[PDB]
């Protein structure tokens, strides 16, 4: 019994998304979960749910909705899924194999693109081993790819692990910046703090 809209729109209309090495995580609680806002708004493409259908988001009571917001390349939008492995999902944002949730993405070329070159939406290039599901790797620690020890100095074979894609508006529709949000939630095991309008 609760009647107060939660900040879903905010999570979606947020002015600036974070880089995919440092993706945000909002605890949604005490919500009426009006999912009509998402698939009623204009672009909001690839509304892909797993273990749930997009229309069955109003007859449910979830335990703890998590909204994870970030920005990735257009080709990687498919790697933000269960059982995927490549460059993005291996070291920056691993989904678990048993994910119940909705991945939502929309083209943000009109919004996250500098014609002088964009150098603020970093992603991680080098990391020794995969991330476990829902791990944030904000480590700025340099990575040794050569036989020379890096000793706190960047250089040949001593890379900064983070670098930006670069987002020009004239970049191929394939790789323009895509804003992504990932709605994780658990189903029926506990007193639900979010429920659909009923």
């Amino acid at each position: 019994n609760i009647t107060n809209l939660c900040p879903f729109d905010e999570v979606f209309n947020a002015t600036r998304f974070a880089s995919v090495y440092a993706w945000n995580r909002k605890r949604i609680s005490n919500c009426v979960a009006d999912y009509s806002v998402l698939y009623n708004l204009a672009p909001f493409f690839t509304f892909k749910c797993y273990g749930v259908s997009p229309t069955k988001l109003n007859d449910l009571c979830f335990t703890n909705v998590y909204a994870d917001s970030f920005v990735i390349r257009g080709d990687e939008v498919r790697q933000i899924a269960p059982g995927q492995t490549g460059n993005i999902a291996d070291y920056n944002y691993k989904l678990p194999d048993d994910f119940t949730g909705c991945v939502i993405a929309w083209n943000s070329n009109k919004l996250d693109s500098k014609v002088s070159g964009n150098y603020n939406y970093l992603y991680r290039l080098f990391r020794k081993s995969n991330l476990k599901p829902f791990e944030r790797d904000i480590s700025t620690e340099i990575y040794q790819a050569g036989n020379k020890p890096c000793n706190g100095v960047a250089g040949f074979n001593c890379y900064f692990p983070l670098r930006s894609y670069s987002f020009r508006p004239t970049y191929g529709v394939g790789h323009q910046p895509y804003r992504v949000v990932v709605l994780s939630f658990e189903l029926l095991h506990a007193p639900a703090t979010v429920c659909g309008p009923k």
Partner: antibody
Amino acid sequence: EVQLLDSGGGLVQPGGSLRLSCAVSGFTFSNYAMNWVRQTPGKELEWVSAISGTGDDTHYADSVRGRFTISSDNSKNTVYLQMNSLRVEDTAIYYCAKAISRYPWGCLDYWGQGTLVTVSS
Amino acid sequence: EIVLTQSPGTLSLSPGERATLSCRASQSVSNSYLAWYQQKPGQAPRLLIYGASSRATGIPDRFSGSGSGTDFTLTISRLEPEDFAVYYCQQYGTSPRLTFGGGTKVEIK
């Protein structure tokens, strides 16, 4: 449609300064860029300055680089065009206009009524 | 940089007929980042088409265009009196600077 109130046009002597403002209401300011474009009376339109939607990233046309200084504020929800040492070729109508993009590129959808700016002696 | 125009079609047409507007690019602009305004003699320009294939808000379906590579065409189906105005080329999406070509005046005769 977002409305735009272009204001601050006037007469200023060569070598003077002037302070244009374009008040804006009807969209999220921190989300879409503002552009500044001239048209000198009866000749072609020329772009002069632009500013990113956040408020930091700016550019200026080569005839006004180092003379014009753009600024904005998410508190009063407006863009400023501060300019110094105007020359006789700087006479125009100025139009403020929103671009489709957050950082300055792209095209301009909605345009102010525009303001007369005159330089004479 | 990117050049354009190639503007014949200023010939004074009469109200209510088909008029086609040529726009020739020199480098095959990418992602079809072209747009068209109209301005009447003493008022601010207003956007008509963007994406070189997408109509803006508050624009009658009377306006339409298409193009790709080096060649774009604004094709107006017919001509109400308020359409006797100047139309512009506007390549956008590179080192912005914005871009305004010579134009095209369609007048009455």
